[PDB]
Write an enzyme that holds these catalytic residues in place. Sequence first.
Site, short mmCIF file in Angstrom:
data_model
loop_
_atom_site.label_atom_id
_atom_site.label_comp_id
_atom_site.label_asym_id
_atom_site.label_seq_id
_atom_site.Cartn_x
_atom_site.Cartn_y
_atom_site.Cartn_z
N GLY A 15 0.81 -1.22 0.00
CA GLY A 15 0.00 0.00 0.00
C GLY A 15 0.84 1.26 0.00
O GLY A 15 1.97 1.25 -0.50
N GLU A 89 10.81 -7.09 13.02
CA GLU A 89 10.30 -8.24 13.77
C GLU A 89 8.94 -8.68 13.23
O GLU A 89 8.16 -7.85 12.76
CB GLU A 89 10.24 -7.98 15.29
CG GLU A 89 9.32 -6.83 15.74
CD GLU A 89 8.89 -6.94 17.21
OE1 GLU A 89 8.20 -7.94 17.57
OE2 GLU A 89 9.23 -6.04 18.00
N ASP A 135 0.06 8.43 11.94
CA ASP A 135 -0.90 7.56 11.27
C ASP A 135 -1.41 6.47 12.19
O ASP A 135 -1.46 5.30 11.82
CB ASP A 135 -0.30 6.97 10.01
CG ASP A 135 -1.35 6.53 9.00
OD1 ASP A 135 -2.59 6.80 9.17
OD2 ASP A 135 -0.92 5.91 8.01
#
Length: 274
Positions: A15, A89, A135
């Site tokens: 995205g 991770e 965000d």
Amino acid sequence: PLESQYQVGPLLGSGGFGSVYSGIRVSDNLPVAIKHVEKDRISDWGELPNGTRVPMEVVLLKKVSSGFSGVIRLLDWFERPDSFVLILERPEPVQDLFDFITERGALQEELARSFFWQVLEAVRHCHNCGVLHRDIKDENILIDLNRGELKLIDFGSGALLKDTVYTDFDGTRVYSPPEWIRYHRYHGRSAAVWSLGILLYDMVCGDIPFEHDEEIIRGQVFFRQRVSSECQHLIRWCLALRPSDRPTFEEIQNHPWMQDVLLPQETAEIHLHS
């Protein structure tokens, strides 16, 4: 030297952030996520203490890399001719909060409390390290299903935390505060608190409260699900039109709805069937 270090798996997602692959560290069979970002699509660039030019995302991840498990951990990165590759991770099993809410609907309040507290602890860690995420939303939160622990991901719209005004934004519009929409101006912490109000509503109601600029600006909050009076109060507080009327992080965690949070492990045993 890259190829001889990681075994690349299937595409996990793509995205605005890039393209993320499941991977394994060949040296110790460690689950990793391999995120690729094209240099051409890189918003703004930063500053390694040694002074190489890297995308801000790399800057921000290193600033928040530590033992604390509330934020994703950057393990390594490489530069390629046209891209940067980030090794991150990967919890296993894992699911994001958007998928979780899609699959399960509005969350019980006991669960939304545990999850939201953990988000708060993670954003506090970011701010503490001079990092503004920019965000915060369900899609950028992973759930480590075994441990009932949440992780913030995707710092690709973040900035260094400052106390002066931001006149730039490229996070998710529906999570952006009325002062961004109206004036193209916000301050880090108060904008963060707004998005935290949107996310809390998302948890308890199963969807976000506003879809359109007019709704964001008008600020009126309608509850579509049965939500407790205290949760409603907290949410409306976070979603105060005037940024200065918003709660501080401290005021949020001192709020009565936030009392007697579950431990992450407790949360997994009860709500994640673990």
